[PDB]
């Protein structure tokens, strides 16, 4: 009854918190500051006539 | 009709009773008496400003 209380273990609980959208993340080169994007608009195929 | 009755078999029914939480059981060394645990509290990432 005269000893100092001693620790069995000390346990770092480290939970790996994850970003669910990480598989979308592209990686750039961090150069310039404006990203732009563009598409090509539809031109529907037309019938041909020989007249 | 004058013989003593004789045993065909005697059958020890031994059912293996299982602890369903046994896969959680860590094993320590039984040394000391206080287990403690700790986490690291959140510090949210902050924007940087050059001023």
């Amino acid at each position: 009854k005269y000893l100092f209380p001693k620790i069995n273990e000390t346990l770092l609980i480290d939970i790996a918190l994850g970003n669910r959208f990480n598989w979308l993340a592209k990686e750039q080169d961090f150069i310039g500051q404006y990203s732009e994007e563009y598409v090509i608009m539809d031109t529907v195929p037309i019938n041909m006539d020989l007249s």
Side-chain angles (χ1 to χ4, degrees), chain A:
Chain A
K1 296 179 291 296
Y2 295 101
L3 285 166
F4 190 79
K6 298 182 188 295
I7 283 292
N8 193 356
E9 71 180 5
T10 181
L11 186 65
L12 177 66
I13 297 170
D14 186 75
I15 299 168
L17 302 169
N19 185 6
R20 186 172 287 175
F21 296 101
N22 202 1
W23 62 277
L24 294 173
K26 300 294 185 289
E27 181 168 357
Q28 62 183 355
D29 51 351
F30 185 61
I31 278 301
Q33 54 174 348
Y34 287 101
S35 298
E36 68 177 359
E37 63 185 4
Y38 64 99
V39 296
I40 302 298
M41 298 295 285
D42 281 326
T43 60
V44 65
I46 62 170
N47 190 186
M48 69 174 290
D49 50 350
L50 299 169
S51 66

PDB file of all heavy atoms in Angstrom, chain A residues 5-39:
ATOM      1  N   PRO A   5       1.205   4.487  -8.155  1.00  0.00           N
ATOM      2  CA  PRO A   5       0.403   3.735  -9.137  1.00  0.00           C
ATOM      3  C   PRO A   5       1.036   3.743 -10.510  1.00  0.00           C
ATOM      4  O   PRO A   5       1.488   4.780 -10.998  1.00  0.00           O
ATOM      5  CB  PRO A   5      -0.918   4.500  -9.155  1.00  0.00           C
ATOM      6  CG  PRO A   5      -0.928   5.229  -7.918  1.00  0.00           C
ATOM      7  CD  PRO A   5       0.427   5.577  -7.559  1.00  0.00           C
ATOM      8  N   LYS A   6       1.048   2.582 -11.149  1.00  0.00           N
ATOM      9  CA  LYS A   6       1.829   2.416 -12.357  1.00  0.00           C
ATOM     10  C   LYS A   6       0.917   2.095 -13.532  1.00  0.00           C
ATOM     11  O   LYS A   6      -0.125   1.459 -13.377  1.00  0.00           O
ATOM     12  CB  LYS A   6       2.892   1.346 -12.147  1.00  0.00           C
ATOM     13  CG  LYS A   6       3.866   1.755 -11.057  1.00  0.00           C
ATOM     14  CD  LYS A   6       4.957   0.761 -10.836  1.00  0.00           C
ATOM     15  CE  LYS A   6       5.765   1.112  -9.618  1.00  0.00           C
ATOM     16  NZ  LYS A   6       6.485   2.383  -9.809  1.00  0.00           N
ATOM     17  N   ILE A   7       1.320   2.566 -14.702  1.00  0.00           N
ATOM     18  CA  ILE A   7       0.511   2.500 -15.913  1.00  0.00           C
ATOM     19  C   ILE A   7       0.723   1.165 -16.608  1.00  0.00           C
ATOM     20  O   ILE A   7       1.860   0.740 -16.838  1.00  0.00           O
ATOM     21  CB  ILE A   7       0.839   3.679 -16.840  1.00  0.00           C
ATOM     22  CG1 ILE A   7       0.184   4.950 -16.317  1.00  0.00           C
ATOM     23  CG2 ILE A   7       0.436   3.410 -18.272  1.00  0.00           C
ATOM     24  CD1 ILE A   7      -1.323   4.900 -16.427  1.00  0.00           C
ATOM     25  N   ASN A   8      -0.381   0.485 -16.916  1.00  0.00           N
ATOM     26  CA  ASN A   8      -0.302  -0.720 -17.728  1.00  0.00           C
ATOM     27  C   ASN A   8       0.011  -0.372 -19.176  1.00  0.00           C
ATOM     28  O   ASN A   8       0.981  -0.877 -19.751  1.00  0.00           O
ATOM     29  CB  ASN A   8      -1.613  -1.495 -17.619  1.00  0.00           C
ATOM     30  CG  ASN A   8      -1.524  -2.900 -18.172  1.00  0.00           C
ATOM     31  OD1 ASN A   8      -0.504  -3.321 -18.716  1.00  0.00           O
ATOM     32  ND2 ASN A   8      -2.598  -3.651 -18.009  1.00  0.00           N
ATOM     33  N   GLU A   9      -0.799   0.490 -19.784  1.00  0.00           N
ATOM     34  CA  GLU A   9      -0.574   0.917 -21.155  1.00  0.00           C
ATOM     35  C   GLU A   9      -1.053   2.351 -21.303  1.00  0.00           C
ATOM     36  O   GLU A   9      -1.877   2.838 -20.525  1.00  0.00           O
ATOM     37  CB  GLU A   9      -1.313   0.029 -22.160  1.00  0.00           C
ATOM     38  CG  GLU A   9      -2.817   0.239 -22.133  1.00  0.00           C
ATOM     39  CD  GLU A   9      -3.569  -0.618 -23.116  1.00  0.00           C
ATOM     40  OE1 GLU A   9      -2.936  -1.464 -23.780  1.00  0.00           O
ATOM     41  OE2 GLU A   9      -4.797  -0.424 -23.235  1.00  0.00           O
ATOM     42  N   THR A  10      -0.515   3.032 -22.303  1.00  0.00           N
ATOM     43  CA  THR A  10      -1.096   4.272 -22.791  1.00  0.00           C
ATOM     44  C   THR A  10      -1.367   4.092 -24.278  1.00  0.00           C
ATOM     45  O   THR A  10      -0.537   3.540 -25.008  1.00  0.00           O
ATOM     46  CB  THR A  10      -0.203   5.487 -22.477  1.00  0.00           C
ATOM     47  OG1 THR A  10      -0.824   6.684 -22.958  1.00  0.00           O
ATOM     48  CG2 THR A  10       1.211   5.358 -23.034  1.00  0.00           C
ATOM     49  N   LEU A  11      -2.560   4.479 -24.709  1.00  0.00           N
ATOM     50  CA  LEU A  11      -3.087   4.050 -25.998  1.00  0.00           C
ATOM     51  C   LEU A  11      -3.472   5.266 -26.823  1.00  0.00           C
ATOM     52  O   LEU A  11      -4.501   5.895 -26.568  1.00  0.00           O
ATOM     53  CB  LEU A  11      -4.285   3.127 -25.805  1.00  0.00           C
ATOM     54  CG  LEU A  11      -4.837   2.510 -27.084  1.00  0.00           C
ATOM     55  CD1 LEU A  11      -3.804   1.587 -27.696  1.00  0.00           C
ATOM     56  CD2 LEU A  11      -6.131   1.774 -26.812  1.00  0.00           C
ATOM     57  N   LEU A  12      -2.659   5.588 -27.818  1.00  0.00           N
ATOM     58  CA  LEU A  12      -3.032   6.615 -28.778  1.00  0.00           C
ATOM     59  C   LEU A  12      -4.103   6.060 -29.702  1.00  0.00           C
ATOM     60  O   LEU A  12      -3.835   5.163 -30.504  1.00  0.00           O
ATOM     61  CB  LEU A  12      -1.819   7.066 -29.575  1.00  0.00           C
ATOM     62  CG  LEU A  12      -2.123   8.085 -30.669  1.00  0.00           C
ATOM     63  CD1 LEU A  12      -2.606   9.399 -30.108  1.00  0.00           C
ATOM     64  CD2 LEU A  12      -0.910   8.292 -31.507  1.00  0.00           C
ATOM     65  N   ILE A  13      -5.320   6.578 -29.585  1.00  0.00           N
ATOM     66  CA  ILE A  13      -6.381   6.230 -30.520  1.00  0.00           C
ATOM     67  C   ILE A  13      -6.263   7.162 -31.718  1.00  0.00           C
ATOM     68  O   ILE A  13      -6.573   8.352 -31.624  1.00  0.00           O
ATOM     69  CB  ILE A  13      -7.762   6.330 -29.870  1.00  0.00           C
ATOM     70  CG1 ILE A  13      -7.875   5.330 -28.728  1.00  0.00           C
ATOM     71  CG2 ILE A  13      -8.838   6.056 -30.889  1.00  0.00           C
ATOM     72  CD1 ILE A  13      -9.101   5.518 -27.894  1.00  0.00           C
ATOM     73  N   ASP A  14      -5.796   6.632 -32.842  1.00  0.00           N
ATOM     74  CA  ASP A  14      -5.629   7.410 -34.063  1.00  0.00           C
ATOM     75  C   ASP A  14      -6.559   6.851 -35.128  1.00  0.00           C
ATOM     76  O   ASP A  14      -6.318   5.764 -35.662  1.00  0.00           O
ATOM     77  CB  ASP A  14      -4.185   7.387 -34.544  1.00  0.00           C
ATOM     78  CG  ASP A  14      -3.961   8.309 -35.720  1.00  0.00           C
ATOM     79  OD1 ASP A  14      -3.904   9.538 -35.506  1.00  0.00           O
ATOM     80  OD2 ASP A  14      -3.862   7.808 -36.859  1.00  0.00           O
ATOM     81  N   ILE A  15      -7.608   7.600 -35.442  1.00  0.00           N
ATOM     82  CA  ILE A  15      -8.595   7.204 -36.435  1.00  0.00           C
ATOM     83  C   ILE A  15      -8.220   7.852 -37.758  1.00  0.00           C
ATOM     84  O   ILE A  15      -8.026   9.071 -37.828  1.00  0.00           O
ATOM     85  CB  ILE A  15     -10.009   7.611 -35.997  1.00  0.00           C
ATOM     86  CG1 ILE A  15     -10.368   6.906 -34.689  1.00  0.00           C
ATOM     87  CG2 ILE A  15     -11.015   7.269 -37.072  1.00  0.00           C
ATOM     88  CD1 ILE A  15     -11.603   7.449 -34.024  1.00  0.00           C
ATOM     89  N   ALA A  16      -8.093   7.038 -38.801  1.00  0.00           N
ATOM     90  CA  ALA A  16      -7.734   7.531 -40.129  1.00  0.00           C
ATOM     91  C   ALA A  16      -8.982   8.094 -40.789  1.00  0.00           C
ATOM     92  O   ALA A  16      -9.769   7.361 -41.385  1.00  0.00           O
ATOM     93  CB  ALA A  16      -7.118   6.419 -40.967  1.00  0.00           C
ATOM     94  N   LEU A  17      -9.164   9.406 -40.679  1.00  0.00           N
ATOM     95  CA  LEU A  17     -10.299  10.080 -41.287  1.00  0.00           C
ATOM     96  C   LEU A  17     -10.042  10.259 -42.777  1.00  0.00           C
ATOM     97  O   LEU A  17      -8.969  10.716 -43.180  1.00  0.00           O
ATOM     98  CB  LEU A  17     -10.519  11.429 -40.609  1.00  0.00           C
ATOM     99  CG  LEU A  17     -10.753  11.307 -39.102  1.00  0.00           C
ATOM    100  CD1 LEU A  17     -10.703  12.637 -38.405  1.00  0.00           C
ATOM    101  CD2 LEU A  17     -12.080  10.669 -38.843  1.00  0.00           C
ATOM    102  N   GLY A  18     -11.019   9.891 -43.597  1.00  0.00           N
ATOM    103  CA  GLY A  18     -10.848   9.868 -45.033  1.00  0.00           C
ATOM    104  C   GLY A  18     -11.780  10.825 -45.751  1.00  0.00           C
ATOM    105  O   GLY A  18     -12.927  11.019 -45.351  1.00  0.00           O
ATOM    106  N   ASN A  19     -11.263  11.417 -46.827  1.00  0.00           N
ATOM    107  CA  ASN A  19     -12.039  12.224 -47.753  1.00  0.00           C
ATOM    108  C   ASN A  19     -12.663  11.293 -48.773  1.00  0.00           C
ATOM    109  O   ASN A  19     -11.944  10.666 -49.548  1.00  0.00           O
ATOM    110  CB  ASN A  19     -11.129  13.230 -48.457  1.00  0.00           C
ATOM    111  CG  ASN A  19     -11.877  14.205 -49.351  1.00  0.00           C
ATOM    112  OD1 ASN A  19     -13.103  14.242 -49.393  1.00  0.00           O
ATOM    113  ND2 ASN A  19     -11.122  14.984 -50.105  1.00  0.00           N
ATOM    114  N   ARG A  20     -13.984  11.271 -48.828  1.00  0.00           N
ATOM    115  CA  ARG A  20     -14.693  10.351 -49.702  1.00  0.00           C
ATOM    116  C   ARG A  20     -14.559  10.731 -51.173  1.00  0.00           C
ATOM    117  O   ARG A  20     -14.675   9.861 -52.042  1.00  0.00           O
ATOM    118  CB  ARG A  20     -16.161  10.299 -49.260  1.00  0.00           C
ATOM    119  CG  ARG A  20     -17.017   9.292 -49.973  1.00  0.00           C
ATOM    120  CD  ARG A  20     -18.377   9.187 -49.344  1.00  0.00           C
ATOM    121  NE  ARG A  20     -18.327   8.496 -48.066  1.00  0.00           N
ATOM    122  CZ  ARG A  20     -19.372   8.348 -47.263  1.00  0.00           C
ATOM    123  NH1 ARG A  20     -20.550   8.839 -47.610  1.00  0.00           N
ATOM    124  NH2 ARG A  20     -19.240   7.695 -46.120  1.00  0.00           N
ATOM    125  N   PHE A  21     -14.218  11.980 -51.473  1.00  0.00           N
ATOM    126  CA  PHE A  21     -14.064  12.447 -52.842  1.00  0.00           C
ATOM    127  C   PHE A  21     -12.615  12.455 -53.311  1.00  0.00           C
ATOM    128  O   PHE A  21     -12.285  13.198 -54.237  1.00  0.00           O
ATOM    129  CB  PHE A  21     -14.633  13.855 -52.977  1.00  0.00           C
ATOM    130  CG  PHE A  21     -16.104  13.942 -52.733  1.00  0.00           C
ATOM    131  CD1 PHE A  21     -16.586  14.391 -51.521  1.00  0.00           C
ATOM    132  CD2 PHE A  21     -17.004  13.608 -53.726  1.00  0.00           C
ATOM    133  CE1 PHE A  21     -17.934  14.483 -51.294  1.00  0.00           C
ATOM    134  CE2 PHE A  21     -18.355  13.699 -53.504  1.00  0.00           C
ATOM    135  CZ  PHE A  21     -18.820  14.138 -52.286  1.00  0.00           C
ATOM    136  N   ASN A  22     -11.744  11.653 -52.696  1.00  0.00           N
ATOM    137  CA  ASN A  22     -10.323  11.719 -53.008  1.00  0.00           C
ATOM    138  C   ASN A  22      -9.997  11.091 -54.355  1.00  0.00           C
ATOM    139  O   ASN A  22      -9.005  11.474 -54.982  1.00  0.00           O
ATOM    140  CB  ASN A  22      -9.527  11.037 -51.901  1.00  0.00           C
ATOM    141  CG  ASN A  22      -8.088  11.489 -51.851  1.00  0.00           C
ATOM    142  OD1 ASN A  22      -7.663  12.344 -52.630  1.00  0.00           O
ATOM    143  ND2 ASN A  22      -7.330  10.933 -50.913  1.00  0.00           N
ATOM    144  N   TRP A  23     -10.820  10.165 -54.835  1.00  0.00           N
ATOM    145  CA  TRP A  23     -10.584   9.539 -56.128  1.00  0.00           C
ATOM    146  C   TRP A  23     -10.931  10.449 -57.300  1.00  0.00           C
ATOM    147  O   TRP A  23     -10.636  10.094 -58.446  1.00  0.00           O
ATOM    148  CB  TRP A  23     -11.377   8.235 -56.217  1.00  0.00           C
ATOM    149  CG  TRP A  23     -12.847   8.439 -56.118  1.00  0.00           C
ATOM    150  CD1 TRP A  23     -13.579   8.577 -54.980  1.00  0.00           C
ATOM    151  CD2 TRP A  23     -13.777   8.502 -57.201  1.00  0.00           C
ATOM    152  NE1 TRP A  23     -14.904   8.746 -55.284  1.00  0.00           N
ATOM    153  CE2 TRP A  23     -15.053   8.700 -56.643  1.00  0.00           C
ATOM    154  CE3 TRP A  23     -13.653   8.415 -58.588  1.00  0.00           C
ATOM    155  CZ2 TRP A  23     -16.195   8.812 -57.422  1.00  0.00           C
ATOM    156  CZ3 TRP A  23     -14.788   8.528 -59.361  1.00  0.00           C
ATOM    157  CH2 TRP A  23     -16.043   8.723 -58.778  1.00  0.00           C
ATOM    158  N   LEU A  24     -11.544  11.602 -57.044  1.00  0.00           N
ATOM    159  CA  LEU A  24     -11.775  12.612 -58.065  1.00  0.00           C
ATOM    160  C   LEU A  24     -10.609  13.563 -58.231  1.00  0.00           C
ATOM    161  O   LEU A  24     -10.561  14.292 -59.226  1.00  0.00           O
ATOM    162  CB  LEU A  24     -13.002  13.443 -57.718  1.00  0.00           C
ATOM    163  CG  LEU A  24     -14.315  12.694 -57.750  1.00  0.00           C
ATOM    164  CD1 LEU A  24     -15.385  13.605 -57.222  1.00  0.00           C
ATOM    165  CD2 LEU A  24     -14.597  12.296 -59.173  1.00  0.00           C
ATOM    166  N   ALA A  25      -9.684  13.579 -57.282  1.00  0.00           N
ATOM    167  CA  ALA A  25      -8.680  14.628 -57.200  1.00  0.00           C
ATOM    168  C   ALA A  25      -7.606  14.406 -58.249  1.00  0.00           C
ATOM    169  O   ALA A  25      -6.771  13.506 -58.116  1.00  0.00           O
ATOM    170  CB  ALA A  25      -8.071  14.659 -55.805  1.00  0.00           C
ATOM    171  N   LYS A  26      -7.625  15.225 -59.291  1.00  0.00           N
ATOM    172  CA  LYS A  26      -6.488  15.315 -60.182  1.00  0.00           C
ATOM    173  C   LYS A  26      -5.363  16.069 -59.487  1.00  0.00           C
ATOM    174  O   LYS A  26      -5.550  16.699 -58.447  1.00  0.00           O
ATOM    175  CB  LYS A  26      -6.881  16.018 -61.477  1.00  0.00           C
ATOM    176  CG  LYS A  26      -7.986  15.318 -62.232  1.00  0.00           C
ATOM    177  CD  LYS A  26      -7.511  13.975 -62.740  1.00  0.00           C
ATOM    178  CE  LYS A  26      -8.556  13.311 -63.611  1.00  0.00           C
ATOM    179  NZ  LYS A  26      -9.723  12.845 -62.817  1.00  0.00           N
ATOM    180  N   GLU A  27      -4.175  15.999 -60.057  1.00  0.00           N
ATOM    181  CA  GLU A  27      -3.080  16.789 -59.527  1.00  0.00           C
ATOM    182  C   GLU A  27      -2.428  17.584 -60.642  1.00  0.00           C
ATOM    183  O   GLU A  27      -2.034  17.023 -61.668  1.00  0.00           O
ATOM    184  CB  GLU A  27      -2.052  15.925 -58.816  1.00  0.00           C
ATOM    185  CG  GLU A  27      -0.932  16.752 -58.250  1.00  0.00           C
ATOM    186  CD  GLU A  27      -0.068  15.972 -57.321  1.00  0.00           C
ATOM    187  OE1 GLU A  27      -0.397  14.793 -57.081  1.00  0.00           O
ATOM    188  OE2 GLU A  27       0.933  16.536 -56.837  1.00  0.00           O
ATOM    189  N   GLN A  28      -2.321  18.884 -60.429  1.00  0.00           N
ATOM    190  CA  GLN A  28      -1.728  19.814 -61.365  1.00  0.00           C
ATOM    191  C   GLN A  28      -0.311  20.158 -60.922  1.00  0.00           C
ATOM    192  O   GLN A  28       0.244  19.549 -60.006  1.00  0.00           O
ATOM    193  CB  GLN A  28      -2.606  21.051 -61.455  1.00  0.00           C
ATOM    194  CG  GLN A  28      -2.698  21.738 -60.135  1.00  0.00           C
ATOM    195  CD  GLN A  28      -3.612  22.914 -60.159  1.00  0.00           C
ATOM    196  OE1 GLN A  28      -4.135  23.300 -61.198  1.00  0.00           O
ATOM    197  NE2 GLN A  28      -3.830  23.489 -59.003  1.00  0.00           N
ATOM    198  N   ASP A  29       0.288  21.146 -61.583  1.00  0.00           N
ATOM    199  CA  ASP A  29       1.649  21.572 -61.298  1.00  0.00           C
ATOM    200  C   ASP A  29       1.732  22.889 -60.530  1.00  0.00           C
ATOM    201  O   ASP A  29       2.845  23.336 -60.238  1.00  0.00           O
ATOM    202  CB  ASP A  29       2.441  21.669 -62.605  1.00  0.00           C
ATOM    203  CG  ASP A  29       1.732  22.501 -63.661  1.00  0.00           C
ATOM    204  OD1 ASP A  29       0.553  22.858 -63.446  1.00  0.00           O
ATOM    205  OD2 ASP A  29       2.362  22.811 -64.698  1.00  0.00           O
ATOM    206  N   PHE A  30       0.585  23.491 -60.188  1.00  0.00           N
ATOM    207  CA  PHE A  30       0.479  24.747 -59.436  1.00  0.00           C
ATOM    208  C   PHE A  30       1.237  25.872 -60.145  1.00  0.00           C
ATOM    209  O   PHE A  30       2.218  26.429 -59.651  1.00  0.00           O
ATOM    210  CB  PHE A  30       0.927  24.542 -57.981  1.00  0.00           C
ATOM    211  CG  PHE A  30       0.737  25.732 -57.098  1.00  0.00           C
ATOM    212  CD1 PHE A  30      -0.518  26.247 -56.872  1.00  0.00           C
ATOM    213  CD2 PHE A  30       1.807  26.284 -56.429  1.00  0.00           C
ATOM    214  CE1 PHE A  30      -0.696  27.341 -56.046  1.00  0.00           C
ATOM    215  CE2 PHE A  30       1.631  27.369 -55.597  1.00  0.00           C
ATOM    216  CZ  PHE A  30       0.376  27.895 -55.403  1.00  0.00           C
ATOM    217  N   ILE A  31       0.761  26.167 -61.355  1.00  0.00           N
ATOM    218  CA  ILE A  31       1.411  27.055 -62.311  1.00  0.00           C
ATOM    219  C   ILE A  31       0.325  27.792 -63.073  1.00  0.00           C
ATOM    220  O   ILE A  31      -0.580  27.172 -63.634  1.00  0.00           O
ATOM    221  CB  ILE A  31       2.346  26.264 -63.244  1.00  0.00           C
ATOM    222  CG1 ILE A  31       3.689  26.030 -62.561  1.00  0.00           C
ATOM    223  CG2 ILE A  31       2.530  26.946 -64.544  1.00  0.00           C
ATOM    224  CD1 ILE A  31       4.366  27.326 -62.192  1.00  0.00           C
ATOM    225  N   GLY A  32       0.371  29.115 -63.049  1.00  0.00           N
ATOM    226  CA  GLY A  32      -0.744  29.898 -63.533  1.00  0.00           C
ATOM    227  C   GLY A  32      -1.871  29.867 -62.521  1.00  0.00           C
ATOM    228  O   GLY A  32      -1.772  29.270 -61.453  1.00  0.00           O
ATOM    229  N   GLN A  33      -2.963  30.539 -62.860  1.00  0.00           N
ATOM    230  CA  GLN A  33      -4.085  30.537 -61.936  1.00  0.00           C
ATOM    231  C   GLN A  33      -5.456  30.353 -62.552  1.00  0.00           C
ATOM    232  O   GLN A  33      -6.414  30.235 -61.788  1.00  0.00           O
ATOM    233  CB  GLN A  33      -4.104  31.822 -61.103  1.00  0.00           C
ATOM    234  CG  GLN A  33      -4.094  33.087 -61.911  1.00  0.00           C
ATOM    235  CD  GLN A  33      -4.269  34.321 -61.057  1.00  0.00           C
ATOM    236  OE1 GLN A  33      -4.610  34.227 -59.881  1.00  0.00           O
ATOM    237  NE2 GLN A  33      -3.998  35.486 -61.631  1.00  0.00           N
ATOM    238  N   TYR A  34      -5.612  30.341 -63.867  1.00  0.00           N
ATOM    239  CA  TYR A  34      -6.930  30.201 -64.468  1.00  0.00           C
ATOM    240  C   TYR A  34      -7.011  28.891 -65.232  1.00  0.00           C
ATOM    241  O   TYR A  34      -6.228  28.652 -66.155  1.00  0.00           O
ATOM    242  CB  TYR A  34      -7.263  31.391 -65.364  1.00  0.00           C
ATOM    243  CG  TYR A  34      -7.569  32.614 -64.551  1.00  0.00           C
ATOM    244  CD1 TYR A  34      -6.630  33.611 -64.378  1.00  0.00           C
ATOM    245  CD2 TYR A  34      -8.797  32.760 -63.934  1.00  0.00           C
ATOM    246  CE1 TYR A  34      -6.909  34.711 -63.611  1.00  0.00           C
ATOM    247  CE2 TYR A  34      -9.086  33.854 -63.173  1.00  0.00           C
ATOM    248  CZ  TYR A  34      -8.145  34.831 -63.022  1.00  0.00           C
ATOM    249  OH  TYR A  34      -8.448  35.929 -62.258  1.00  0.00           O
ATOM    250  N   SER A  35      -7.940  28.041 -64.821  1.00  0.00           N
ATOM    251  CA  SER A  35      -8.297  26.830 -65.539  1.00  0.00           C
ATOM    252  C   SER A  35      -9.548  27.119 -66.348  1.00  0.00           C
ATOM    253  O   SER A  35     -10.525  27.639 -65.808  1.00  0.00           O
ATOM    254  CB  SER A  35      -8.566  25.679 -64.570  1.00  0.00           C
ATOM    255  OG  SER A  35      -7.423  25.349 -63.803  1.00  0.00           O
ATOM    256  N   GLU A  36      -9.527  26.792 -67.630  1.00  0.00           N
ATOM    257  CA  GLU A  36     -10.725  26.927 -68.435  1.00  0.00           C
ATOM    258  C   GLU A  36     -11.037  25.601 -69.104  1.00  0.00           C
ATOM    259  O   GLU A  36     -10.213  24.687 -69.148  1.00  0.00           O
ATOM    260  CB  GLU A  36     -10.589  28.018 -69.492  1.00  0.00           C
ATOM    261  CG  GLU A  36      -9.607  27.687 -70.576  1.00  0.00           C
ATOM    262  CD  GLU A  36      -9.566  28.752 -71.638  1.00  0.00           C
ATOM    263  OE1 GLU A  36     -10.330  29.730 -71.517  1.00  0.00           O
ATOM    264  OE2 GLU A  36      -8.770  28.614 -72.588  1.00  0.00           O
ATOM    265  N   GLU A  37     -12.245  25.513 -69.642  1.00  0.00           N
ATOM    266  CA  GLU A  37     -12.702  24.283 -70.257  1.00  0.00           C
ATOM    267  C   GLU A  37     -13.698  24.625 -71.348  1.00  0.00           C
ATOM    268  O   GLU A  37     -14.314  25.691 -71.336  1.00  0.00           O
ATOM    269  CB  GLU A  37     -13.323  23.354 -69.223  1.00  0.00           C
ATOM    270  CG  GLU A  37     -14.547  23.941 -68.601  1.00  0.00           C
ATOM    271  CD  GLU A  37     -15.097  23.100 -67.490  1.00  0.00           C
ATOM    272  OE1 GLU A  37     -14.478  22.072 -67.142  1.00  0.00           O
ATOM    273  OE2 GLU A  37     -16.166  23.473 -66.977  1.00  0.00           O
ATOM    274  N   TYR A  38     -13.839  23.711 -72.301  1.00  0.00           N
ATOM    275  CA  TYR A  38     -14.696  23.975 -73.443  1.00  0.00           C
ATOM    276  C   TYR A  38     -15.147  22.661 -74.048  1.00  0.00           C
ATOM    277  O   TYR A  38     -14.489  21.632 -73.892  1.00  0.00           O
ATOM    278  CB  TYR A  38     -13.989  24.843 -74.488  1.00  0.00           C
ATOM    279  CG  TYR A  38     -12.780  24.234 -75.138  1.00  0.00           C
ATOM    280  CD1 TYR A  38     -12.869  23.638 -76.384  1.00  0.00           C
ATOM    281  CD2 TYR A  38     -11.536  24.312 -74.539  1.00  0.00           C
ATOM    282  CE1 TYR A  38     -11.764  23.093 -76.986  1.00  0.00           C
ATOM    283  CE2 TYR A  38     -10.428  23.767 -75.137  1.00  0.00           C
ATOM    284  CZ  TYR A  38     -10.548  23.162 -76.359  1.00  0.00           C
ATOM    285  OH  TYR A  38      -9.439  22.618 -76.961  1.00  0.00           O
ATOM    286  N   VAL A  39     -16.287  22.714 -74.724  1.00  0.00           N
ATOM    287  CA  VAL A  39     -16.859  21.563 -75.407  1.00  0.00           C
ATOM    288  C   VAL A  39     -17.012  21.919 -76.872  1.00  0.00           C
ATOM    289  O   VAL A  39     -16.612  23.005 -77.294  1.00  0.00           O
ATOM    290  CB  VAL A  39     -18.210  21.171 -74.797  1.00  0.00           C
ATOM    291  CG1 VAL A  39     -18.027  20.720 -73.378  1.00  0.00           C
ATOM    292  CG2 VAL A  39     -19.146  22.341 -74.863  1.00  0.00           C
TER     293      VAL A  39
END
